[PDB]
C-alpha cells in the first residue's frame, strides 16, 4: 500500500446501500489488466494506464449499471507467471488527479511507488485508494490511474522467453454504491456479444454485389490510405465511409463538352454531389459512399473502367442505353488532379458526349494492365475536410484484409476493353464492428479474439483495435497467406494495446 | 393476501446471498405485463398468463443474470385507467403447477382470487406466494401461472373505448438468490437498444442499388407472398432470403438449345443452384438470395427484363457482350411452370444460344405493362422444401412496407425494351432486425415501438411481431400513403399480440 485510503463516511449520501458479502472473498480478474513485457520492450514504456472505477471487478462492473454513485478503493495482487532466467525491474506508481502523468520513469519515482522486480516469483499485492474530496464520486473525473511502467529491461540469461502479467482485483471493506434509482443501460459492460457469423456471409464495404471468399494477409502492405469502410467505435463511420455501402454504390454526373489536351477521346464530366451542392471545402467533395479504387499515379496504359454507363432517357423516369466504358479520376496529365479525389473526371468514347445531359454510372471492374497492387493504393486527397488518416499496424503484426474476387466483364467491339479480374481488399466489414456499440469498448483497450474453424480444431488469435483493424502476428515471408471464411468470430478478453499474441500463425 | 408464502430455510443451498434493501420499497413495472380490454372481447379469454419468476422486476431481472437460484413471492398492483361510464368486472387468481385451469370465470373463483371493478381508479395489490415444492427453484418449472380473465362482460354501447392495464410488481422481503458464481450472460434481457439510423440508410432486400425512398402504407394489399426480406426472430433468415442481400444478388445460368412453342426468339435456360447441386427436393431450388419478383399468371406482353446479362470468355476469366436483355420464368404455357419459382426460366433474344454455355444475369427491371400491383405478388412456390408460410395481419390494422423507387433503363434498337419506372417493397429490412439477437423477444409478446420525426413534433407508433412485420393501425381506406424515412425508431414497451395501439395514422 504506497498510500492510505479515505474513510468514505458517505454522511450526506443518501439511501446507501449494502453489497453482497461474498464478492469481498472471492476476487476476480481486472478486465482490462493483462499485458506481457518480451526482451525487446523499450525501458521507459507505460504497460498499463487504468483508472480506479467501479470497472475493476466482473462483479462492480456489472452491478454499477444500476447506480449512480460509489465510493471506495480496491486491492489487487499481481500473477507473474515469471521465469527462472529472466531478471528485470518493474514499477507500480499511484497518480493522483488534476496531475499531467509524468512519461518518464525519472519523474514517475518521485509518486507514491513500489518497485518489483522478476525474480521475486510469487505473487505481491497492492492497494488501490480512491482520492476524493467530495463525499462520493458519482461519475465523473474519476482520476487516480495506476500506470505501471518497466524500469529495467529483462536481459534473459538464456532463452528471451516472454512475461505475461495479470492482475486479480477484490472491492476494499469500505465499498459502497448510491441511489439506485438509474434502472439500467448507462456504462460499458466487461463482455462482447458477437454473434456467429461467417465472414463469408458479410457485405464488402469496398466493392460489393462480390461476396467475401477468404481473409487475405500480406507481408509487403504495411500500410493502409483507404477511405471506405473506415469505421470507429468513438466516431461510428468516419471519413467517407457509410453504413449502407450497397445503396449509395450508383452515381450520377454531368457532361461539360470538352476534352483534355493530348487525347480527345477522353470526355471531360463533373461528378453530383447532393450532400455537398457548393464545393465548401469543408465537406467531401465527391458523393459519399463512391468508388476510391487506385489506378496508378500518371499512366494511360491502364484505366478502371467504370462499366455500365447510361445516357438520360429525356422523360425523367430513368435512363437509356447501359453500356460499358471506361474512366479515370482527373485527366492523367496533370500531377496536382491526377490522383486527388475530387469531381472532374473523364471518360473514354469515341462518339461524342451530350452535351449537358446527366448520365448514370456503376462502377465495377478495373481494365489495362492493372494488378491488385495498383488498385489497393488509393488516390490521395488533399483539402480541408477531415479525411482517414494514414494506418499502419505496431511493428511486427500484420492485417487482415477481408479480400473478395473480382471478375472481368470485357467486349469484343470496335473499341474494345482490356478488362481483366483482379482482387479488392476492405480494412473491416460493417456487419462485424456494428456489434460493439451496445457494449462499447473500455478506454484504451484492444479486443483479444479468436477465428476458430472446423470444429474448433484449429483456432487463430486476432486483436482488433480501436480504430478497427486486425493483427495476427507473424509466422515468416510469404505471398499473402489465405484464411478459410468457414468460421465464427468469438470473444476471449481484453488486452493493452502492447499485448504480444501467444499463438503464432502457424502458415 | 388470500394465499400464504413458504418460508424455505433453504438448508441445501451453499452461500446464500443478500440483495439491496431499498428494491422491495420500490415497486417498478413487470416487462411483458401490460394488455386492453374492448367491448368486443370474446368470453373466456386468457387476457394474461404471465408466469411467476425473479423477471417481474426490472432490478431483479439484472440481478437474476449472476446467480444460479432464487426463492420467494412478490406484491403485484395493478393499473386500470378506465372512465366514469365503463361497467364490468375484472378477476386475477393464482393457479398452482401441475392444475388444469378451466376456462369459464365460474369455475375460475376457486382459487385464491381478487376481483376489481373497472372504474376503480385505484391501485388494488394481490400477493403472488411463490408455490414450490422443493429447496428451492434452479431455473425450471415455476409455473404459479397469474391468469386474469372477465368476470361480467361491460355491456355499454354509447362509449366504444379501450381500455389499458398495467402491472407492477414488488419483491417480498423474504427473496434471496444463491450461487453468485456464474458471472453473467445466462439468460435473456428486458430492454433493447434500436440504434439511430433512419430506413433512409438502410437496404432494401428485395431490391438493392436502390435507397429506400418513403415508408408506404396501402389499404389494398392485405397479404404478403414474398420470399425475400422475410426474417424472424428466432428462425434467423427464413425462406431463400439472406442477411447479405448485396452478395447474392448476382445469378448465372446455362443455356439448353431450345425455344418454346410459338414463339421462336424465347430460348430456354436453366439456372444453375450451387447450393443444391442434386436436386433434392427437401432443398429450396433457386440460389439463395435471387429475384422473385411477378409477372403475372399469363401474360407475352408484361415481361420484366434481366437488363444486364453475358457470356464467359471461353477461358473461364472473365465475362463478355453485357447487355439489356429480357427473361421470365417457366414457360408462359404449362400450368406448373407459367409462375412457380423453378429453376427453369426462358431468356428473350433472336439468336439462339450455345448449349452448356456459362451466363450471368443481373435482374433488374420491369418491361411492358406491369405495375407495383402485379411485381408486389410472388410466383407460387411447389414442392416440400420449407418456404416462407403467408402473412396477414389480424383486423384492424395495415402493413407498412419499405418502399423503393426502381428507375427505367430502356434503349432504341430494333428490338429495344419499353421498361417503364415501378416501385418494389419489401417486409422488413435486415438492419433493424439484426439488433434484436443479442436481447431477443420475451415469450408471446410483440414491442411496442416509436418513430420519431422531426425533432419530436411528431411520432407515430408502430408494432412489431416477432415474424418481422410492422403494423401501424388504420383509420380509413387509402390508394398509397407516404411517411418521411427522416426519423429514426425508439423502442417503447413489450405489448400483449392483441394490445390495441394509440395513436391513429388518418387514413
Redesign the interface.
Known amino acids: 500500500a504506497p498510500l492510505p485510503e479515505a474513510t468514505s463516511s458517505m454522511s450526506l449520501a443518501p ?1 446507501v ?2 453489497i ?4 469481498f472473498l472471492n476476487p ?1 480478474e481486472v478486465p482490462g489488466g493483462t499485458f506481457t513485457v518480451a526482451s525487446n520492450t523499450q525501458p521507459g514504456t507505460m504497460l498499463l494506464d487504468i483508472e480506479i472505477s467501479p470497472e475493476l471487478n ?2 462492480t462492473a ?2 454499477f ?2 447506480y449512480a454513485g460509489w465510493s471506495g478503493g480496491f486491492a489487487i495482487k499481481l500473477l507473474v507467471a515469471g521465469n527462472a532466467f529472466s531478471a528485470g525491474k518493474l514499477i507500480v506508481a499511484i497518480i493522483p488527479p488534476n496531475v499531467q502523468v509524468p512519461n518518464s520513469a525519472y519523474l514517475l519515482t518521485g509518486f507514491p511507488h513500489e518497485i518489483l522486480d522478476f525474480r521475486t516469483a510469487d505473487q505481491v499485492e497492492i492497494i488501490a485508494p480512491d482520492i476524493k474530496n467530495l463525499d462520493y464520486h458519482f461519475r465523473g473525473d474519476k482520476l487516480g490511474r495506476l500506470v505501471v511502467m518497466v524500469y529495467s529491461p529483462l536481459r534473459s540469461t538464456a532463452t528471451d522467453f516472454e512475461i505475461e502479467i495479470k492482475l486479480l482485483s477484490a472491492p476494499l471493506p469500505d465499498f459502497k454504491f448510491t441511489m ?1 434509482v438509474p ?3 448507462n456504462n460499458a459492460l ?2 462482447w ?1 458477437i ?1 456467429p ?1 461467417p465472414p463469408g ?4 464495404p469496398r466493392s ?5 471468399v477468404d481473409l487475405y494477409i500480406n507481408s509487403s502492405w504495411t500500410t493502409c490510405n483507404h477511405q471506405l469502410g473506415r469505421y470507429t467505435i468513438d466516431g461510428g463511420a468516419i471519413g467517407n465511409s ?9 452515381g450520377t454526373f454531368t457532361a461539360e463538352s470538352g476534352s483534355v489536351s493530348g487525347q480527345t477521346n477522353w470526355r471531360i464530366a463533373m461528378l453530383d454531389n447532393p450532400y455537398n451542392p457548393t464545393s465548401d471545402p469543408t465537406l467531401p467533395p465527391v458523393p459519399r459512399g463512391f468508388c476510391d479504387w487506385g489506378s496508378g499515379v500518371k499512366s494511360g496504359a491502364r484505366q478502371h473502367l467504370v462499366c ?1 454507363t ?1 445516357v438520360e ?1 429525356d422523360n425523367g ?6 453500356d ?1 466504358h471506361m474512366w479515370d479520376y482527373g485527366d492523367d496529365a496533370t500531377i496536382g488532379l491526377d490522383n486527388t479525389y475530387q469531381r472532374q473526371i473523364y471518360i473514354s468514347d469515341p462518339t461524342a458526349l451530350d452535351s449537358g445531359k446527366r448520365y448514370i454510372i ?1 462502377p465495377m471492374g478495373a481494365s489495362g494492365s492493372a494488378t491488385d497492387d495498383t488498385l489497393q493504393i488509393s488516390p490521395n486527397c488533399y483539402g480541408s475536410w477531415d479525411y482517414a488518416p494514414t494506418i499502419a499496424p505496431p511493428l511486427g503484426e500484420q492485417i487482415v484484409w477481408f479480400r473478395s474476387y473480382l ?6 467491339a470496335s473499341s474494345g476493353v482490356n ?3 483482379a482482387h479488392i481488399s476492405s480494412l473491416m466489414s460493417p ?1 462485424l464492428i ?2 460493439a ?2 457494449s462499447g469498448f473500455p478506454e484504451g483497450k484492444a479486443a483479444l479474439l479468436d477465428y476458430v474453424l472446423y470444429g474448433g480444431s484449429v483456432v487463430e488469435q486476432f486483436k482488433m483495435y480501436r480504430e478497427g483493424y486486425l493483427t495476427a502476428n507473424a509466422t515468416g515471408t510469404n505471398t499473402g497467406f489465405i484464411i478459410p471464411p468457414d468460421g465464427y468470430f468469438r470473444f476471449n478478453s481484453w488486452v493493452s494495446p502492447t499485448f504480444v499474441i501467444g499463438n503464432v500463425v502457424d502458415l
Not at 20 to 23: R, T
Not at 201 to 204: E, I, L, P, T, Y
Not at 317 to 322: H, I
Open positions: 439511501t446501500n449494502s453482497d458479502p461474498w464478492i476476480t466482473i462483479f456489472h452491478m449499471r444500476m439506485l434502472p439500467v443501460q466487461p463482455i456479444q454473434p457469423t456471409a458479410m457485405v464488402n460489393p454485389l462480390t461476396p467475401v457509410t453504413f449502407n455501402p450497397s445503396g449509395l454504390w450508383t455500365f447510361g432517357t423516369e430513368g435512363y437509356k442505353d447501359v460499358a456503376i471478375p472481368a466483364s470485357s467486349t469484343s478488362s481483366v479480374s456487419d456494428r456489434s456499440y451496445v
